[PDB]
């Protein structure tokens, strides 16, 4: 009972690349059918961490539920949530990954944020997020109002502090900036905490899953 990915990569599918939402949703599958060289993946360029490990974790699943870990319109009262890009276009229209939110400043401010989530799903929860590395200082100031930014992510099984490095990368899909993608599996009962003062590409949707 295989999961057909079509023109998408696991990266495209799991992040919610706009071209990848046309695929039929599944709650279980024995293996993953995926084109050798898939067209749509990370529509916004960046490094996807532990990618091979993640494909293996997702290889076979007995239960799969997408849920809104951090509701878009509720979680972020003092930040702007509408961020979109032509690099992630859908129907000729600038857009973004279904499963992440591009947070930016609001009314001249990007207030320190702290958002936590407790896994009460009784199944492992796959959580994904990103860290944005602007191509220059102008974009850094315009988006986040802060030049010295950090993103911090913590649970019982994950602990990292990220800092953007602002500089040009080779132009890919019309971007010289980058987004690095990260993920963790959260134990039942464990809590994960995100803190940032800029540059967080927040989780919007997460995945409760079983593998056997």
């Amino acid at each position: 009972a295989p999961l057909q990915l079509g023109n998408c990569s696991v990266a495209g599918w799991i992040l919610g690349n706009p071209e990848c939402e046309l695929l039929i949703s599944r709650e279980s599958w024995s293996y993953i059918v995926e084109k050798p060289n898939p067209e749509n993946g990370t529509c916004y360029p960046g490094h996807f961490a532990d990618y091979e490990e993640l494909r293996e974790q997702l290889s076979s699943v007995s239960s799969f539920e997408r849920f809104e870990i951090f509701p878009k319109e509720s979680s972020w009262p003092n930040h702007t949530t509408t961020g979109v890009s032509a690099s992630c276009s859908h129907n000729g229209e600038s857009s973004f990954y279904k499963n992440l939110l591009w947070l930016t400043g609001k009314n001249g401010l990007y207030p320190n944020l702290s958002k936590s989530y407790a896994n009460n799903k009784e199944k492992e929860v796959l959580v994904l997020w990103g860290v944005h590395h602007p191509p220059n200082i102008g974009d850094q100031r315009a988006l986040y109002h802060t030049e010295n930014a950090y993103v911090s992510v913590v649970s019982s099984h994950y602990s990292r502090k990220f800092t953007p490095e602002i500089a040009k990368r080779p132009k890919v899909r019309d971007q010289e900036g980058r987004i690095n993608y990260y993920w963790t599996l959260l134990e039942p009962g464990d809590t994960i905490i995100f803190e940032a003062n800029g540059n967080l590409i927040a989780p919007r949707y997460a995945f409760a899953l079983s593998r056997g």
Epitope: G83, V84, S85, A86, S87, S94, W102, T104, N107, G108, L109, P135, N136, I137, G138, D139, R141, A142, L143, H145, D174
Partner: antibody, heavy 126, light 99 residues
Framework: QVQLVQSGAEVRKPGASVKVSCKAS????????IHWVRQAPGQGLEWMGW????????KYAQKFEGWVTMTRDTSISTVYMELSRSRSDDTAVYYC???????????????????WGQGTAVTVSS | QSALTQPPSVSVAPGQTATITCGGN??????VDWFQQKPGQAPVLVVYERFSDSNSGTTATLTISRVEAGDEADYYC???????????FGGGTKLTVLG
Amino acid sequence: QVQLVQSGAEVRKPGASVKVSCKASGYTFTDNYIHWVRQAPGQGLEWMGWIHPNSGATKYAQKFEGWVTMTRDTSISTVYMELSRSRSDDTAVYYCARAGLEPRSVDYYFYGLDVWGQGTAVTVSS
Amino acid sequence: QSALTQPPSVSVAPGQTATITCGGNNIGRKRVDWFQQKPGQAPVLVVYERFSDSNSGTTATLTISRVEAGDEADYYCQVWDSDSDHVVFGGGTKLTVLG
């Protein structure tokens, strides 16, 4: 509705301070950047910098950095532009403009200048 | 002379179509704000069936269809330069409606 009203024309001697004010109304003052742009007689428009009334953060054009100071008073919805050491160079009309045109993408994340003040004529002579 | 390049002057008879071009680095991938300035007045942001906008590579174009007397003005293009965090204005185009 939304408008910016600036103070009146000024004549100053060089080396003196020139302070121009801009009062905003018709909207929430703390929402938007306020820019200053100037126009010398017979010439075009040159950006001087902005101030955000909410944070008080400022940014000046390289050419004006160190010569100009922008401030805000939220209680009276007014921003100021000040030339601390004025020169004959500084004779021009000065505008304030509200940056209320919201950007549609993070690819080009710049708020556009949608509402301008009427301008203040500043003359600097000894 | 200016970071953005505009033709110094355009003259057009009423009813005709006026076209104003703006040249600049990566202009085609940005929003180019146009400003209309009439004599003795402050600039106003040009907002928009007559007035339309169109970019391409290093060229942004403001098109005014069926020109009227109230269209006569100086027009300035403007963008934000990402790298130096700096607002830049074109040198302006004096648009005359031949009356």
